[PDB]
C-alpha cells in the first residue's frame, strides 16, 4: 500500500477526506452521557399494602409473587422485602448483556397472572414493574418561597402542570414524581360517630355507592322503532368533584327526622396520599421530578432543554414558587469532557513543537497535525458502528490512545527525515525506501496491540462492561492509526517534504554529542551483559514485590458537587423527633460552610437501609466547583469535618459520606453475605444464628473491619387480640372489627373521583388525635347484632411484643444481609472466603450465599489469568511471525516488566491505587513500551540480514537509528499527559488514576528500554545461535 | 360533530327519601336503555 | 404414524362425532391400510 498511495498522493486525501466526513457527520449524532450502560439489569416490583405491619407484606404479597415468578430466561438472583410501611420490592438482577426490555416484559407478564392471588387492596393500589439500573439524569426540584402553600398543593400543582411538558422533551425517557397530588381525603371522628350510631363501614358503603358512574346508553339506539328521527346519548350519575359536595353525602336519617350528613361526622380536606415522607428545602417545602434520560440522547443537550422549557413557564407558576436544581450530572459531564478536548488539543500542539525542536522544519511538523485528527475524526466512525457514546469511559479511554496515535505518525514521519538526510535521497524516493524498513513492522505492530486489548474486551460482569469500552476505543483507534499510518502519511511525507546558530543550532550539537555518547554506553555494556542481566531481576521482583503491595479499588471517587447524609435515629422515634435532627443537621452546613454548601434538600422519613419515620436523607448541593479553591474545600475534606461534628450528637446515628464514582451501582467497595435460613427455622432463630456469626467474627478483628448488618433491629410494636368468644357473644361480626381497626387506623381507599379534568383517590382514615396512645382504642365504638354498640376494651385485649420493622428474603427464602469489607492489608479474596468458613460452622439449616458485588467478583475473579495466557501466546506468535524466528520473540516480550516498574513506583508514592483506571494504564504502556522494542529488534535484524554487519556492530547502529522517534515519543506524549496529573478540579480523580500511571510508567520505559533491548537482542541471539 | 345529550339529573336525596336504593336506579337504566350483559349460554356448541 | 383428527365442521356434536368415527374407523377395518396400536388418544 504505501508504495502504491506514494505515487497517487490524490487517492490518500479521498480516503482521508471521506474518514474525516464519517467522524463529523457521527459527532453529531453519537449519544452523550455520564457512562455507558454497566450494571445488570435489574426489575423492581414495588406493590403497595397501606397500613400493613411488616409481616403482612410478606405473608400475603412477597410471598405470593415468589412463588409464582417461574419461567424467566437468564434470572441471575432475586432479592426482595418487606417494610412496616406496607411496601415490599422485588428486584430480580438479570444476565449482563440481556435485553432489559424483553426482561422486563416477561417479569411483568409473571406478576399479571399472580395478580388475583395478591389481596384486594394490593391490587387496587396496583403493582409497577419498573427499571432499577437507570440512573437519573437530574432532580429539579420546585419550592415554596412565601411558604402559602404545604408540599401537597407544590406537589398537586406538578402533577398537573410541570409533569406533562417536561415528560414530552425531547430525550426525556422517564419522568419520576417525588409526591403525590391531591386525594380527598376524609378526616373521622370517634366521638362523634358513637353519638350517632355509626361505624367505619357505614361510612365505607355511602362512598362506595354515591360517587359512582353509570352506562345510560343511548336514547332511540339500534334497533329503533320504525320511524325514528331522535338519536342522542344519555348522561347518568356522574362523579362529585367539590369538597362541599361529599360533606352533602347522607349517610344516615335519625329516626326523629333529622339528616345525618358526613360533614357533620367527618372533616373533609383535600390532602396528600401519603404522609410517610416530609420533603424540604433549606427549611422549606418541596417538591421534585426524578428526570431520567432517554436510550440515545444528548445528556448535555436534554439537561438544556429541560431548563429551557422550565423558563417557558416561570411566569405561570403562582406566586411564591422556584425551581431549584439539588443535584445535576450535566455540568460533572460538561467539565469531564471538555477536560479531554483540552488534551487531545494539546498533545496535536506539543507534537507539532516537539518535531519542531528535532527536525526544524515546518512542512514536517504539519504532517501529523493533519495525520492525528484523522484517526481521531476516523474512530468516532467507528465508534458510533458499535453504537457505542461519549462518555467518562470512552474519552478517557482515547486519550490513553493519544500516545498509540503520536508514536505511529512520529516512527513514519521520522524515519523518512533521517533517510533524507543520511542517504540524500529526494522527498518522493526517500519515503519509498524508508517505508520499505517499517512497513513490515507497522502491520505487525497492529497485530500485536490487537492482541493484547482483544483480550480485555472478553471479561464478564460489570467488570468487563467498562473494559469493553477501553478495548474497543483504544483497538479502533489503534487499527486506524496503522491503516493511516500505511495510506495517508506516505502520500503527505513525499509530497510536503523538502529536499535537504542561536538555540536549534546548539541544541542540535549538544543532541549530537549525546547521542554517541549514548552509543558508547551501549557499546561498553554489551561487551558485560553478564552483569546487567542481574539487573534484569532485581527489577523484575521490584516489579512483583510492588504490584502485591498495591492496594485494589474499582474506581476513583470524584467530587461531583454533592454528597449525601443519612439521620437514623433509635427505635420508634416518630417523625417529629427526626424534623429536628434534621433541622440541627440542616442548620450546621448553612451556617458553618454557608461558603460551600448551596442547598439541602431534608428528605424525611426515607432510607437507602430502610424506611419508617427513624430516619432521613439529605442531599446537599454544595458550590460550583470555580468557587472551591483549593483542597479545603473537596467533598472528602467537607465529609470529614460534618463526620467529626455529629459524633456530637445524641439521639442519633449520623453520618455523611460522598457518592459512589457511579451511582448506578452501590458503594461496589467491600463484600456482600447473605445468612439464608434454608431449613425454615423461622425469624427468630435466624437472628440467633446472625448474632453467633457477628460475636465470633470479633476474634478476627485483623482480617474482617467493620462487618454490620444492614436491616432494622426488631421493635416494639403494639399487639391487639380480638377474643373470638367474647365477639360473637355480643354479636359483632369479626369481618367489622378487621374493617374498623383497619380502616380508623391504617387508612382505606375507598373509590376514585375526578376533579380538575384527572381522577384522583378517596382515602378515610380516623383523626390525628384519635389514634396516638394505646389509650385511644377504648374510644372506638363498633354497631352489634341488635344496633347497641360496644367498644374495643370490651372484646379486644392488647400487650406489646417485638418485631421486625423490615423483613427480609432471597431467593425465596429468609435472610439477613450482611455487608463489610476486608481489613487493611488483606485481599477481600481472603477476607470473603474467611466468612464462607465462619458462616460454616453456624447452626444446622442456615445456609449463605454472596449477592451484588461478591457474587460478580465470584465469576470475574477466574478469568484473570486466563486471559492474558492467551493474550501472551498469541502475542508471541504475531512476534515470531514477523521476526520470522522462534527465539528473538524473547527480546520483544521481557521488556514488559521495564514499563510497568515506572507506573507502579509513581502509583505507589502518589497513593494511588490498582484501580480500573490504573490498569488500563498499564497497558498502553506495555504496549507503547514494545512498540519502541519492535523497532530496535527488527532494525538490528534488517541490518544483520541484509548489510551482513556483525551482531555487535548492528546493535549498535539500531539503537542509534531510533535513539530520536523515542525520544520524541516519549517526551511529547509525557507532556501531552502531564496535565491530567496536576489537575485537581472536577473530574480529577479519574484524570490523576489515568495520568500518574502513565506518565510513571513511560518515564522508566524509555529510560530502561533503550539500554536493555539491545543487551536482549544480543543475549538471546547469542545464546540461540 | 357537536351533538344533543340527554342528561338525567338523579336527585340522590329523593331517591333515599322515596326507599330506593341507588343500586337498583344504576342498574335499571343501565340494563333497560343500555342493555347489559349477564352471562354467556352455549348455542350449537359455542359460546355467546 | 400420522395423527389424522376428525375435526367436526358442521356443529354436529360430540355424540355424533363419535359416532362418526366409528364408521370411519369401521371403514379402515375392512381395508387394512395401517399398523401397530391404530390408538385413539382420547378417552
Known amino acids: 500500500m504505501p508504495n502504491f498511495f506514494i505515487d497517487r498522493p490524490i487517492f490518500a486525501w479521498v480516503i482521508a477526506i471521506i474518514i474525516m466526513l464519517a467522524g463529523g457527520l457521527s459527532i453529531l449524532k453519537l449519544p452523550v452521557a455520564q457512562y455507558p450502560t454497566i450494571a445488570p439489569p435489574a426489575i423492581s416490583i414495588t406493590a403497595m399494602y397501606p397500613g400493613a405491619d411488616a409481616e403482612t407484606v410478606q405473608n400475603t404479597v412477597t410471598q405470593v409473587i415468589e412463588q409464582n415468578m417461574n419461567g424467566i430466561d437468564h434470572l441471575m438472583y432475586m432479592s426482595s422485602n418487606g417494610d412496616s410501611t406496607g411496601t415490599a420490592t422485588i428486584t430480580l438482577t438479570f444476565e449482563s448483556g440481556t435485553d432489559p426490555d424483553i426482561a422486563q416484559v416477561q417479569v411483568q407478564n409473571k406478576l399479571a397472572l399472580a395478580t388475583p392471588l395478591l389481596p384486594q387492596e394490593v391490587q387496587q393500589q396496583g403493582i409497577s414493574v419498573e427499571k432499577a439500573s437507570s440512573s437519573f439524569l437530574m432532580v429539579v426540584g420546585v419550592i415554596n418561597t412565601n411558604g402559602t402553600m404545604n408540599q401537597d398543593d407544590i406537589s398537586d400543582y406538578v402533577a398537573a402542570n410541570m409533569k406533562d411538558p417536561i415528560s414530552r422533551t425531547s430525550g426525556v425517557g422517564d419522568v419520576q414524581l417525588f409526591g403525590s397530588q391531591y386525594a380527598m381525603r376524609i378526616w373521622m371522628d370517634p366521638n362523634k360517630l358513637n353519638n350517632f350510631q355509626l361505624t367505619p363501614v357505614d361510612v365505607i358503603s355511602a362512598l362506595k355507592a354515591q360517587n359512582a358512574q353509570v352506562a345510560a346508553g343511548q336514547l332511540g339506539g339500534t334497533p329503533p322503532v320504525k320511524g325514528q328521527q331522535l338519536n342522542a346519548s344519555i348522561i347518568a350519575q356522574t362523579r362529585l368533584t367539590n369538597t362541599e359536595e361529599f360533606g352533602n353525602i347522607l349517610l344516615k336519617v335519625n329516626q326523629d327526622g333529622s339528616q345525618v350528613r358526613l360533614r357533620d361526622v367527618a372533616k373533609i380536606e383535600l390532602g396528600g396520599e401519603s404522609y410517610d415522607v416530609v420533603a424540604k428545602f433549606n427549611g422549606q417545602p418541596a417538591s421534585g421530578l426524578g428526570i431520567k434520560l432517554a436510550t440515545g440522547a444528548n445528556a448535555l443537550d436534554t439537561a438544556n432543554a429541560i431548563r429551557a422549557e422550565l423558563a417557558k413557564m416561570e411566569p405561570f407558576f403562582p406566586s411564591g414558587m422556584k425551581i431549584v436544581y439539588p443535584y445535576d450530572t450535566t455540568p460533572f459531564v460538561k467539565i469531564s469532557i471538555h477536560e479531554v478536548v483540552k488534551t487531545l488539543v494539546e498533545a496535536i500542539i506539543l507534537v507539532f513543537l516537539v518535531m519542531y525542536l528535532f527536525l526544524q522544519n515546518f512542512r514536517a511538523t504539519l504532517i501529523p497535525t493533519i495525520a492525528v485528527p484523522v484517526v481521531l475524526l476516523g474512530t468516532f466512525a467507528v465508534l458510533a458502528a458499535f453504537g457505542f457514546s461519549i462518555n467518562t469511559l470512552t474519552m478517557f479511554g482515547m486519550v490513553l490512545a493519544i500516545g498509540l496515535l503520536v508514536d505511529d505518525a512520529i516512527v513514519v514521519v521520522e524515519n523518512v527525515e533521517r533517510v533524507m538526510a543520511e542517504e540524500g535521497l529526494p522527498p518522493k524516493e526517500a519515503t519509498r525506501k524508508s517505508m520499505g524498513q517499517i512497513q513490515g513492522a507497522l502491520v505487525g505492530i497492529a497485530m500485536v496491540l490487537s492482541a493484547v486489548f482483544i483480550p480485555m474486551a472478553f471479561f464478564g460482569g460489570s467488570t468487563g462492561a467498562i473494559y469493553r469500552q477501553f478495548s474497543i476505543t483504544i483497538v479502533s483507534a489503534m487499527a486506524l492509526s496503522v491503516l493511516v499510518a500505511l495510506i495517508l502519511t506516505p502520500a503527505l511525507c513525499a509530497t510536503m517534504l523538502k529536499p535537504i546558530t542561536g538555540f536549534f543550532g546548539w541544541f542540535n550539537r549538544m543532541f549530537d554529542k549525546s547521542t554517541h555518547h549514548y552509543t558508547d554506553s551501549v557499546g561498553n555494556i554489551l561487551r558485560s551483559t553478564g552483569r546487567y542481566l542481574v539487573l534484569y531481576l532485581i527489577i523484575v521482583v521490584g516489579m512483583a514485590w510492588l504490584f502485591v503491595r498495591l492496594p485494589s479499588s474499582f474506581l476513583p471517587d470524584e467530587d461531583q458537587g454533592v454528597f449525601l447524609s443519612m439521620a437514623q435515629l433509635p427505635a420508634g422515634a416518630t417523625q417529629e423527633r427526626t424534623q429536628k435532627v434534621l433541622d440541627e443537621m440542616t442548620n450546621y452546613y448553612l451556617t458553618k460552610e454557608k461558603d460551600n454548601v448551596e442547598s439541602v434538600f431534608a428528605v424525611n422519613g426515607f432510607g437507602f437501609a430502610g424506611r419508617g419515620q427513624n430516619t432521613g436523607i439529605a442531599f446537599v448541593s454544595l458550590k460550583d466547583w470555580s468557587q472551591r479553591p483549593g483542597e479545603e474545600n473537596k467533598v472528602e475534606a467537607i465529609t470529614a469535618r460534618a463526620m467529626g ?335 491530567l496529573v496536576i489537575s485537581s478540579g472536577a473530574g480529577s480523580g479519574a484524570q490523576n488514576a489515568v495520568g500518574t500511571g502513565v506518565m510513571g510508567g513511560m518515564v522508566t520505559a524509555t529510560i530502561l528500554a533503550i539500554f536493555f533491548v539491545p543487551v536482549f537482542f544480543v543475549v538471546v541471539r547469542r545464546r540461540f545461535s
Open 645 to 979: 461534628y455529629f459524633s456530637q450528637i445524641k439521639d442519633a446515628m449520623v453520618f455523611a459520606f460522598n457518592l459512589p464514582a457511579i451511582v448506578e451501582l452501590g458503594t461496589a467497595t467491600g463484600f456482600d453475605f447473605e445468612l439464608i435460613d434454608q431449613g425454615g427455622l423461622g425469624h427468630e432463630k435466624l437472628t440467633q444464628a446472625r448474632n453467633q456469626l457477628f460475636g465470633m467474627v470479633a476474634q478476627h478483628p485483623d482480617v474482617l473491619t467493620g462487618v454490620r448488618p444492614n436491616g432494622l433491629e426488631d421493635t416494639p410494636q403494639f399487639k391487639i387480640d380480638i377474643d373470638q368468644e367474647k365477639a360473637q357473644a355480643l354479636g359483632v361480626s369479626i369481618s367489622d372489627i378487621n374493617t374498623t381497626l383497619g380502616a380508623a387506623w391504617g387508612g382505606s381507599y375507598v373509590n376514585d373521583f375526578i376533579d380538575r379534568g384527572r381522577v384522583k383517590k378517596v382515602y378515610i382514615m380516623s383523626e390525628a388525635k384519635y389514634r396516638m396512645l394505646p389509650e385511644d382504642i377504648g374510644k372506638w365504638y363498633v354497631r352489634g347484632s341488635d344496633g347497641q354498640m360496644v367498644p374495643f376494651s370490651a372484646f379486644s385485649t392488647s400487650r406489646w411484643e417485638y418485631g421486625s420493622p423490615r423483613l427480609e428474603r432471597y431467593n425465596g427464602l429468609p435472610s439477613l444481609e450482611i455487608l463489610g469489607q476486608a481489613a487493611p492489608g488483606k485481599s477481600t479474596g481472603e477476607a470473603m472466603a474467611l466468612m464462607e468458613e465462619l458462616a460454616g460452622k453456624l447452626p444446622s439449616g442456615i445456609g449463605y450465599d454472596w449477592t451484588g458485588m461478591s457474587y460478580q467478583e465470584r465469576l470475574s475473579g477466574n478469568q484473570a489469568p486466563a486471559l492474558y495466557a492467551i493474550s501472551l501466546i498469541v502475542v508471541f506468535l504475531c512476534l515470531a511471525a514477523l521476526y520470522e524466528s522462534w527465539s528473538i520473540p524473547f527480546s520483544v516480550m521481557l521488556v514488559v516488566p521495564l514499563g510497568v516498574v515506572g507506573a507502579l513506583l509513581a502509583a505507589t508514592f502518589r497513593g494511588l491505587t490498582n484501580d480500573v483506571y490504573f490498569q488500563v494504564g498499564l497497558l498502553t504502556t506495555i504496549g507503547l513500551s514494545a512498540k519502541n522494542a519492535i523497532l530496535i529488534v527488527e532494525f538490528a535484524k534488517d541490518l544483520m540480514e541484509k548489510e551482513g554487519k556483525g551482531l555487535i556492530e548492528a546493535t549498535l547502529e539500531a539503537v542509534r537509528m531510533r535513539l530520536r522517534p523515542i525520544l520524541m515519543t516519549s517526551l511529547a506524549f509525557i507532556l501531552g499527559v502531564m496535565p
